[PDB]
């Protein structure tokens, strides 16, 4: 059993256990909430695509 606190009073005063804070600022993305873009390669020996 774990009891914690989350409090975002406003502006820059955001306090709470374990801050997470994902980092995607500047990357060309679809929607502001995607948090990371995909990637396709297609290996050359075979031709079946892969996604990362």
Partner 1 sequence: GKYRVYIDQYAKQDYFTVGYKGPNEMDAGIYYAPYVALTPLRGSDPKNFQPV
Partner 2 sequence: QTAVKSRKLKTGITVELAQDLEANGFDAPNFLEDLLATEMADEINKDILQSL
Partner 3 sequence: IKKQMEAGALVEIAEGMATSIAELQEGFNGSTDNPWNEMGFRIDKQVIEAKS
Burial call 3-29: b when 16+ CB within 10 Å, e when fewer: eeeeeeeeeeeeeeeeeeeeeeeeeee
Contact pick of 3, 40, 47, 51 for partner 3 (by CB under 8 A)? 47
Stretch that binds partner 1, among 2-10, 16-24, 25-33, 41-49 (CB under 8 A): 41-49
Give start and end residues of each alpha helix (H) in 1-52. none
CB closer to partner 1 out of 4 and 52: 52
Instruction: Please report whether residue 1 would count as binding partner 2 according to CB under 8 A.
Output: no
Question: Can you give the binding site for partner 3, defined by CB under 8 A?
Answer: 43, 45-48
């Amino acid at each position: 059993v774990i009891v914690g606190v989350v409090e975002n009073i406003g502006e820059k005063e955001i306090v709470g256990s374990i801050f997470y804070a994902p980092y995607t600022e500047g990357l060309d993305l679809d929607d502001p909430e995607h948090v990371g873009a995909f990637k396709v390669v297609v290996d050359p020996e075979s031709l079946q695509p892969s996604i990362g």
